[PDB]
Write an enzyme that holds these catalytic residues in place. Structure first.
Site, short mmCIF file in Angstrom:
data_model
loop_
_atom_site.label_atom_id
_atom_site.label_comp_id
_atom_site.label_asym_id
_atom_site.label_seq_id
_atom_site.Cartn_x
_atom_site.Cartn_y
_atom_site.Cartn_z
N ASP A 215 -6.13 -0.03 0.77
CA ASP A 215 -5.20 0.20 -0.32
C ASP A 215 -4.31 1.37 0.08
O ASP A 215 -4.66 2.55 -0.08
CB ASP A 215 -5.95 0.55 -1.57
CG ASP A 215 -5.10 0.71 -2.83
OD1 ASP A 215 -3.91 1.03 -2.78
OD2 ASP A 215 -5.66 0.50 -3.90
N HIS A 216 -3.08 1.06 0.48
CA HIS A 216 -2.21 2.09 1.00
C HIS A 216 -1.80 3.17 -0.02
O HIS A 216 -1.31 4.22 0.38
CB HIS A 216 -0.99 1.40 1.61
CG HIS A 216 -0.26 2.29 2.62
ND1 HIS A 216 -0.58 3.50 3.06
CD2 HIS A 216 0.90 1.92 3.26
CE1 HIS A 216 0.33 3.88 3.93
NE2 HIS A 216 1.22 2.92 4.05
#
Lengths: 243, 243, 243
Positions: A215-216
């Site tokens: 999850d950036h």
């Protein structure tokens, strides 16, 4: 979000309608919710498991005496648990306010089991505290219960991370989807003998392909590159978990 | 878009809440906006940098005399600027009407710097006009200002393209997220010695992994394949930038 | 979904507005609709085509006598059609109720042609019933009509699967976007000579990179890994299609 236009598929030939199990439909919804919520990046890495493999295979006697099969999965679970403690942002979730991370101080890890009815991800609790033959036994049990529909929804909860291993079927790498609210998932594909430069010539080393999706919003490129680099380092010499 | 259900994470063990810097929150929002707006494709390629590397290392004397460190980044910035001029659709943005591209006639390129507070992408303006030691000096300055919170928001604007280099940490490849309204971002990972068939035998060449993500609404598969092929060609022999 | 903020691009230098063909705009919309609707995963695999290549090249005489060029595309189309029949979930679509798959009993496959005006994906109908020189002839015809704007919208319909080949330009792999309502798309990149361990030493084999993207709501990781593994197996020995 704009829907896909319906097509009359029978204009082109014979069609047949099969239905989806409730499990597939649940699964379908959760993946779509993750997809639209998590801006995904996949970091790819390869780990040298020649020596790990030798170890696995030599402990075949002990594992059979214990009644467990010792695959790569307990070795993978032990190394990610050590790392989930070293790099705590991977062991956390985005708080619903969008402005805090909830860092978990426990390490429970799920692993993907593909059953006829659909995907199940049983959770082994406190992976950081169990031994390789303990995780081997338990992983095997949870998978049998998953296949046999005897897995109680309790054992499908509160994971911090997911390992998805397809190395037993094939493939070079893939881009898995994060099971939100977790923040990362490790995909593992098939090991191959590969030439690896020893400074002077190419040596055949057995290489395991790793695909970390994350999850950036929570994890940036450098942190994820450092996570698969440390994981490749721990799998090349699992004794580093001892220190 | 359907939200992720809240989970009481403390049912599973001890949890702790750390907060997000305003920088992370800004970053989180921008990535999510790009993710939902840009249908992303990543094109992977490897470039032979054996000779580039030799050049870098031989000019260590000149670079130190100039006070700059000459890494792969100014070489990368110079080649993408030459290419952004050759293949102008990569140097453009989708007009808000959804029916025009705004082609930029200038080449400013941002590069990702991961700092404690979050990601910053300083912009070097007119990369096409500066020399390798000029871009080396300037890249270094902007990175120090970025780390030291002295980067003024002016220098974070009007980029046409972004390079994100993680080669100093690890990894084989990754799938970066386009910084909309730009239309592409080049991810660069760790170089490795690799056997490369010379027509008769395998020669060790030093290979750089490139991961071009692009906005598929504006760039189609063939154009992006041609962009990483030309980039691999220019990095294998940077003298082609002279003609 | 939150829009991207407009930027005045002319503050940074000279800009120019070029317009999008109606084809690009259509294409832009369809990709964005797929992106937001399909949670995408890409499975990567490599297939040994040394013997396939030898066969191709030896049948150069027969193909020229027939007036067709025999590229890798008819060989690819024949193998995916055999597989689309073996693994029917890949030949199906999600019913608009979200709770049924419509399994198609026909195999029509589209292939991507990048033209000046934009992307066209002509459909060859009943690929499972045509021979390698028949598919060679027809693929060539449809591509010429596509480039010459003579492709009637009839031939752009009712495909079950799409092959997107960029092997003639470059690249190691890419992550294509599923053309919803189809459930998968095969990307194919450039073949390279690669060392492959024969149990005792590394042999140069010609390897074709495959990138299968799929709709994870309908296809799970194990099924897609099995699909690229069977495809690599059929391409390594296309005679298995005979049994």
């Amino acid at each position: 979000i704009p829907p896909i236009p319906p097509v009359d598929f029978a204009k082109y030939g014979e069609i047949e309608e099969v239905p989806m199990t409730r499990l597939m439909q649940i699964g379908a919804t959760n993946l779509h919710r993750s997809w639209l919520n998590v801006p995904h990046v996949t970091q790819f890495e390869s780990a040298d498991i020649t020596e790990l493999e030798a170890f696995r295979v030599a402990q075949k006697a002990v594992a059979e005496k214990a009644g467990v099969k010792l695959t790569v999965l307990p070795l993978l679970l032990k190394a990610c648990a050590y790392l989930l403690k070293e790099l705590p942002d991977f062991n956390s979730s985005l708080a619903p306010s969008g402005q805090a991370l909830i860092r978990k101080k426990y390490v429970h890890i799920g692993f993907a089991v593909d059953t006829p009815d659909g995907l199940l991800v049983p959770v082994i609790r406190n992976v950081d505290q169990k031994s390789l033959l303990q995780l081997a036994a338990e992983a095997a049990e949870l998978a049998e219960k998953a296949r046999s529909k005897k897995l109680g929804a309790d054992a499908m909860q509160g994971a911090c991370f997911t390992i998805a291993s397809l190395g037993h079927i094939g493939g070079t790498a893939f881009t898995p989807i994060v099971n939100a609210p977790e923040v990362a998932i490790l995909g593992v594909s098939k090991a191959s003998m590969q030439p690896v430069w020893d400074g002077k010539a190419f040596q055949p080393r057995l290489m395991l392909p790793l695909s970390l999706s994350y999850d950036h919003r929570v994890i940036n490129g450098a942190a994820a590159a450092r996570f698969t680099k440390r994981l490749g380092d721990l799998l090349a010499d699992i004794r580093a978990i001892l220190l």
